[PDB]
């Protein structure tokens, strides 16, 4: 019988008690990255994260940081491989920058051979060290040209441009890459990119944020989400019809959270909690498992919710071999009004829920996850049991899928000096406590989880935060980015992997 | 009788001997800037100078600098006005960033109202201080979307997108702006952007520079130059047909140089010198004055030189009310082979000339202009008489045009400390020696020159050089960009203007 801790102090950093041998022999352990966050702009065209961070520097991070140079994995990809080799990792998730291989967006405009060569060399280097690549086609970095031609995922033109990009990736890299992710965190671009305008491309209703160049936060999230699902599904169909000889697997990436009632004896909070599951997870998992959006979304969102045709429904339903599930934290849910006629209405209001990290009796859900220095009542707290609850829910609700945990990690402040930054015991605690619950759910609930990739390989540009936080298991000096030095967490993870 | 110095030491920094009163009462004196170089990316979309500097950081400058934040004239435009007011300047040349007012490139995709407001406030502030705006529509910063959709000026689609952009500018700003420049330095994008790939977008033949993503240095410069002329001419026709009520004037910007024979008794060097005038100046001025390219270009370039239809010829011929002439330096010319079958052939080779700053007897043409620390035999030297020779030539060869000198200036090294940087006596010498010759040519040759704008108002991002050189008449601290402090040159220029 497995017992796992939910509160500080944690004792799962002892590899005598928790290590890779606790999991099945074939289980993959590694780390993750994304292209905007690590590569730099050298050698690629411009994408909407370049555009957004440059047009709206205060939205890029408090330091106005961006991905222009970052950790320079364009130059230092071998050093990334070296970290993975030091870890004895068996997996690495990275993304392909669309703008590096097709700078002009549309494949018929030509490819960048040198960009293709960059990923060939990375892939070959990984495989030579026994590391399985997990490759994200689209980690938010849409070529700027496509956003300017037709507003990107706002328009159905995205589907064929994404398909042709993906086809090039399968053609060039699929002989070696056997695990593909289509779109990173399906929920995020619709809501943050087109709802709150916290993320690229930065569209919203005028009264939500007067700096947005255009948008409608009530309608566009739904349009974009719908196009994401269709573009994803078209790529999965292309993969499974035209690249079956490659013997690989493909799936989407979800951001997952668990949700608990703010007041577990209040029917209204219980209802809000179940609505959140539907609106947060079901928005995408309903289509992916059934070809339809959840009924509560149909009912609430009404004419703002697009319909799938019968052909589209069939294309989207079942459009995965596995799910990449990202998991960071859990929220309490309580009811909230949905003012659909307000000029500041957002899609996110349609769930009719307010989310907190403290429940009605004043209980904080778990240890600190992210401090918010401008408003401490907005601090985020984590909840290790949430990974158990999410995986159990996916198994039970969503037809026992094959799952890889494609991100899980925690930040430390960029204000810490290097010695403090390397002494990242809070990261060991977060990672181990989640791994304990992941082992527990696999054993107790028989969830088909076959790997775990911690966020992040190394310090990088963090969307929305610049270089003001660090997520890496290895440390990068922003004054001299060449080295990636394993932190205490990376050293712990090395021991966990090879105990 | 006016006597002007050609060699150090110069004594024209004495405003007792040379000042604004030496020129006609109406003559405009000011300074110049461009949008990529000064504004920053905040509040605008991405353009090909963002793309180029980010994809090819070693081509942005030795420091890998770029226009992301620069002097932040987005925030500090009032401080630019303040410099101009301190100078008692009567003119200011600035550019509109296309990506700030139409981030999606094509006008039908929507405009950025806040971008429009930015230029309205600048323009209104200038006029309130008695400063005449000279506004460049296109200072190289093409929206990235257009380059990615159709490769920008490589394709005739540029013409209508440029026209619709210009129409928006005339509509929004032409009630106040009475001097418009279409395209900055017509020669530069074809040759550097599409020939040598030193400049955005960075296209060339594969053996010219293997880093180029695509291109053909032998053909594309000509295509791009042809489209520039057509796009320019379509905008001038639009202006003069639809905006005549505004009572303003429009013209192109030329980069001018003079050319002297490397050996003034050698017929081959004399011939190369005359070819250079045709290939450098006539490439554009032939079309602008006659609707045809120079015969030597027709003959040499052959099938690589596009033809104008009779309608196009008529549109381009006479498509200016004035010329903005930029002038920095003069070169000696000697013959050079034109290897049209070589895989590394460039359009620039078609002139059949090699350019130097030292003549056959070892004479350097004038004082140092720009030191090249990697190769000192590649140092640039200036030649004050060249402004006289250029203006005389334009009057005689090109039908006595109205001229404004739209740039003239010199750099100092970014390695200098602030006190050295503010003690910019080399800049006084360059500016005064050229102003002396400009007065001389107006008086002696009756060239219709009606203003002079020195490059640059303040230190900025220099194309190709990052922040490794400074051109400003006012100093900017890159650690805190708010202030623009007049250098010795700016203080001199203040006295020259109001002696
Ligand atoms: C807030 O969360 C706390 C902690 O989960 C809940 O308190 C638990 O309540 C259960 C059922 O009453 C008790 O058996 C436990 O002993 C309590 N745990 C502790 C740490 O107090 C609490 O019920 C939640 N409040 C609401 C209103 O939902
Ligand atoms: C190189 O440039 C120098 C300077 O312009 C030329 O020298 C001048 O030559 C003229 C005509 O012979 C003489 O009257 C001057 O006195 C010379 N000036 C000085 C400073 O020497 C020289 O002829 C040029 N060489 C060539 C080969 O063209
Ligand atoms: C080398 C090592 O320490 N391995 C330990 C193993 O002894 C322990 O029984 C298991 C518990 O899951 O964790 C692992
Ligand atoms: C998504 C998809 O199913 N299939 C395409 C098919 O249309 C195409 O004819 C063939 C060769 O290009 O490769 C495949
Ligand atoms: C240096 C190191 O740790 N190497 C280990 C190797 O001993 C072990 O057999 C393998 C699989 O567990 O993981 C790796
Ligand atoms: C105020 C002042 O110094 N003005 C001088 C003027 O006296 C002089 O005759 C002229 C020569 O061009 O330059 C100016
Ligand atoms: C370049 C040009 O000559 N002219 C246009 C004309 O086509 C248009 O009909 C009218 C109203 O848009 O404004 C003008
Ligand atoms: C402060 C200052 O220098 N103001 C001068 C003003 O005296 C002069 O009349 C005008 C035109 O020459 O230029 C300005
Ligand atoms: C940040 O930038 C936007 C312009 O993009 C401006 O609207 C907003 O006021 C600025 N935010 C703060 C908090 O200053
Ligand atoms: C607009 O929304 C903000 C945040 O969503 C809220 O605090 C404010 O009350 C809203 N105003 C109206 C008019 O509803
Ligand atoms: C930068 O870091 C690398 C790796 O430690 C080191 O070899 C190189 O000398 C350092 N550069 C400077 C300028 O210190
Ligand atoms: C600069 O960058 C390009 C890649 O864009 C590379 O081809 C070239 O070798 C580098 N130049 C030098 C001098 O290192
Ligand atoms: C290619 O050109 C470079 C510079 O243009 C020159 O130095 C070299 O000799 C040329 N090679 C051939 C094959 O002509
Ligand atoms: C930056 O420069 C401005 C103008 O001199 C000054 O007022 C401001 O205090 C300076 N900022 C810092 C942080 O020194
Ligand atoms: Zn940047």
Swiss-Prot record, chains A, B:
Q: What molecular functions are annotated in GO for this chain?
A: beta-glucosidase activity; metal ion binding; thioglucosidase activity
Q: Under which main EC class is this enzyme filed?
A: hydrolase
Q: Can you say where in the cell this protein is located?
A: Vacuole
Amino-acid biosynthesis recorded as keyword:
no
Annotated residues for binding of Zn(2+): 54, 68
Record keywords: Protein biosynthesis included?
no
Give the binding site residues for substrate: 37, 139, 184, 328, 455, 462-463
The active-site annotation reads 407 (nucleophile)
Q: Which reaction does it catalyse?
A: a thioglucoside + H2O = a sugar + a thiol
- Annotated membrane-spanning segments are none
* E.C. code: 3.2.1.147
Top-level taxon of origin? Eukaryota
Q: What is its main location?
A: other
- Keywords on record: Disulfide bond, Glycoprotein, Glycosidase, Hydrolase, Metal-binding, Vacuole, Zinc
Q: Which Pfam families match?
A: Glyco_hydro_1 (PF00232)
The entry's cellular-component GO terms read:
vacuole
Q: Where does L-ascorbate bind?
A: 185, 257
Glycosylated residue positions = 19, 58, 88, 216, 242, 263, 290, 341, 344, 359, 480
* InterPro entries named in the record: Glyco_hydro_1 (IPR001360), Glyco_hydro_1_AS (IPR018120), Glyco_hydro_1_N_CS (IPR033132), Glycoside_hydrolase_SF (IPR017853)
- Disulfide pairs? 4-436, 12-432, 204-212
Q: Summarize tissue expression.
A: In vacuoles called myrosin grains of a certain class of cells, myrosin cells, distributed in the cotyledons and the axis of the embryo as well as in different organs of the growing plant.
Q: Which family does it belong to?
A: Belongs to the glycosyl hydrolase 1 family.
Relate the protein's function as given in its record. Answer: Degradation of glucosinolates (glucose residue linked by a thioglucoside bound to an amino acid derivative) to glucose, sulfate and any of the products: thiocyanates, isothiocyanates, nitriles, epithionitriles or oxazolidine-2-thiones.
Q: Its quaternary structure?
A: Homodimer.
Additional note from the record: It seems that the absence of a catalytic proton donor in plant myrosinases is not impairing the hydrolysis of glucosinolates.
- In Swiss-Prot or TrEMBL terms, this protein is called Myrosinase MA1
């Amino acid at each position: 019988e497995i017992t796992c801790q939910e509160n500080l102090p944690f004792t799962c950093g002892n590899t005598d008690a928790l290590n890779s041998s606790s999991f099945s022999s074939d289980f993959i352990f590694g780390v993750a990255s994304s292209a905007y966050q690590i590569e730099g702009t050298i050698g690629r065209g411009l994408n909407i994260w370049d555009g957004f961070t440059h047009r709206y520097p205060n939205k890029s991070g408090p330091d106005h940081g961006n991905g222009d140079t970052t950790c320079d994995s364009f130059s230092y990809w071998q050093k990334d491989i070296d970290v993975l080799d030091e870890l004895n990792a068996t997996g690495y998730r990275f993304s392909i920058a669309w703008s590096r291989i097709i700078p002009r967006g549309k494949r018929s405009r030509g490819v960048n051979e040198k960009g293709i060569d960059y990923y060939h060399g990375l892939i070959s280097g990984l495989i030579k060290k026994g590391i399985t690549p997990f490759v994200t086609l689209f980690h938010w970095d849409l070529p700027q040209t496509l956003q300017d031609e037709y507003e990107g995922f706002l328009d159905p033109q995205i589907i064929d441009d994404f398909k042709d990009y993906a086809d090039l990736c399968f053609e060039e890299f699929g002989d070696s890459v056997k695990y593909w992710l289509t779109i990173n965190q399906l929920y995020s671009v619709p809501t943050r990119g087109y709802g709150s305008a916290l993320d690229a491309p930065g569209r919203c209703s005028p009264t939500v944020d007067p700096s947005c160049y255009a948008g409608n936060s009530s309608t566009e999230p739904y349009i974009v989400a719908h196009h994401q699902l269709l573009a994803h599904a078209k790529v999965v169909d292309l993969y499974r019809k035209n690249y079956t000889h490659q013997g690989g697997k493909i799936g989407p990436t979800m951001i997952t959270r668990w949700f608990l009632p703010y007041n577990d004896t209040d029917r209204h909070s219980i209802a809000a909690t179940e609505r959140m599951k539907e609106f947060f997870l079901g928005w995408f998992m309903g289509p992916l498992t059934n070809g339809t959006y959840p009924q509560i979304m149909i009912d609430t969102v009404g004419e703002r919710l697009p319909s799938f045709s019968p052909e589209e429904s069939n294309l989207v339903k079942g459009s995965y071999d596995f799910l990449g599930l990202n998991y960071y934290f859990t929220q309490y849910a309580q009811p909230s009004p949905n003012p659909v006629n307000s000029t500041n209405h957002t899609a996110m209001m349609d769930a009719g829920a307010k989310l907190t990290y403290i429940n009605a009796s004043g209980h904080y859900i778990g240890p600190l996850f992210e401090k918010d220095k401008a408003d401490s009542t907005d601090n985020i707290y984590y909840y290790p049991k949430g990974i158990y609850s999410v995986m159990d829910y996916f198994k039970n609700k969503y037809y026992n899928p094959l799952i890889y945990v494609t991100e899980n990690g925690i930040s430390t402040p960029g204000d810490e000096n290097r010695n403090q930054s390397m002494l990242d015991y809070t990261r060991i605690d977060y990672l181990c406590s989640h791994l304990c619950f992941l082992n527990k759910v696999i054993k107790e609930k028989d969830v088909n989880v076959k790997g775990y990739l911690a966020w992040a390989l190394g310090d990088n540009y963090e969307f929305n935060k610049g270089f003001t936080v660090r997520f890496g298991l290895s440390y990068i000096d922003w004054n001299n980015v060449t080295d990636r030095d394993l932190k205490k967490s990376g050293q712990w993870y090395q021991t966990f992997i090879s105990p």
